[PDB]
Design a protein around this ligand. Structure first.
Ligand SMILES: Cc1nc(N)sc1-c1nccn1C
Length: 279
């Protein structure tokens, strides 16, 4: 399938070169997979989600996304226009308040919730979790992410926006999950993206158009935007039968576009997420 005039990041993930604008992908489109978006919530009523999104859990007075961040990330995973995996099922878990903040204890509870809740959902092709959040190093936060991964969920986490080594941030520093840095449309490391040996992969993260609250759209930047590209890619590849939740991060790294990014510090992977789709 070909989506013309796609957001640059979608075009990038199906291309051997920057500077194109059509996204190419197998029409299976993540059908039969599920992606949990652990964030500020999801505006599931947005027409872009086509009834495929729903809120499954909140720790606050509402499950609504009063911020926009979670809706934007969910749109990059799976919206019809802005999403990588256009037929996946999206499940929102609201661990962050409407200012975008959340206690680590609530975030940990949300990860353990997903590890159990997947057994209440129909996801024959596999389960992914996208975590566009983080703070300073916490062994307990890392262990929660490791449990979620161990339970059979492909966990993708943001590297962070500190222009620093991600080893000092959580869950970015957990080795067993997929830690995602951000790149721009010219194949440069995004200026804010964390780096370091703990990164597994880069995805598009600067000037990413996606869904927003109030039935709207907007373009924003962050490792929060790169992470759902990778989460959606994992769901897409799992539906295709090319990999599993346990191995999807390593498969994405093995099949990535290699050596094409600039301003990557010595010792950080130079790997850009790529679907290897041959139309
Ligand atoms: C973080 C970084 N980005 C580059 N293009 S070089 C570089 C770096 N190497 C060693 C230290 N730093 C700060």
């Amino acid at each position: 399938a070909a989506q013309t005039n796609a957001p640059w990041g979608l075009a990038r993930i199906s291309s051997t070169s920057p500077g194109t604008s059509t996204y190419y992908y197998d029409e299976s489109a993540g059908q039969g997979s599920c992606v949990y978006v652990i964030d500020t919530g999801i505006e599931a009523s947005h027409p872009e989600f086509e009834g495929r999104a729903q809120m499954v859990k909140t720790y606050y007075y509402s499950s609504r996304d009063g911020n926009g961040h979670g809706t934007h990330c969910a749109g990059t995973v799976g919206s019809r226009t802005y999403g990588v995996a256009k037929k996946t099922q999206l499940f929102g878990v609201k661990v962050l308040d409407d200012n975008g903040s959340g206690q680590y204890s609530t975030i940990i509870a949300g990860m353990d919730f997903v590890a159990s809740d997947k057994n209440n959902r129909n996801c024959p092709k596999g389960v992914v979790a996208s975590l566009s959040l983080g703070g300073g190093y916490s062994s307990s936060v890392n262990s929660a992410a490791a449990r979620l991964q161990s339970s059979g969920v492909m966990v993708a986490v943001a590297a962070g926006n500190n222009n620093a080594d991600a080893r000092n941030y959580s869950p970015a520093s957990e080795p067993s999950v997929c830690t995602v840095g951000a790149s721009d449309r010219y194949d440069r490391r995004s200026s804010f993206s964390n780096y370091g040996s703990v990164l597994d992969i880069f995805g598009p993260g600067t000037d990413i158009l996606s869904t927003w609250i109030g039935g709207s759209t907007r373009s924003i930047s962050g490792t929060s935007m790169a992470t759902p590209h990778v989460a959606g890619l994992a769901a897409y590849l799992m539906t295709l039968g090319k990999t599993t939740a346990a191995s999807a991060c390593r498969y994405i790294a093995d099949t990535a576009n290699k050596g094409d990014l600039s301003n990557i510090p010595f010792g950080t992977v130079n790997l850009l997420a790529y679907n290897n789709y041959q139309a």
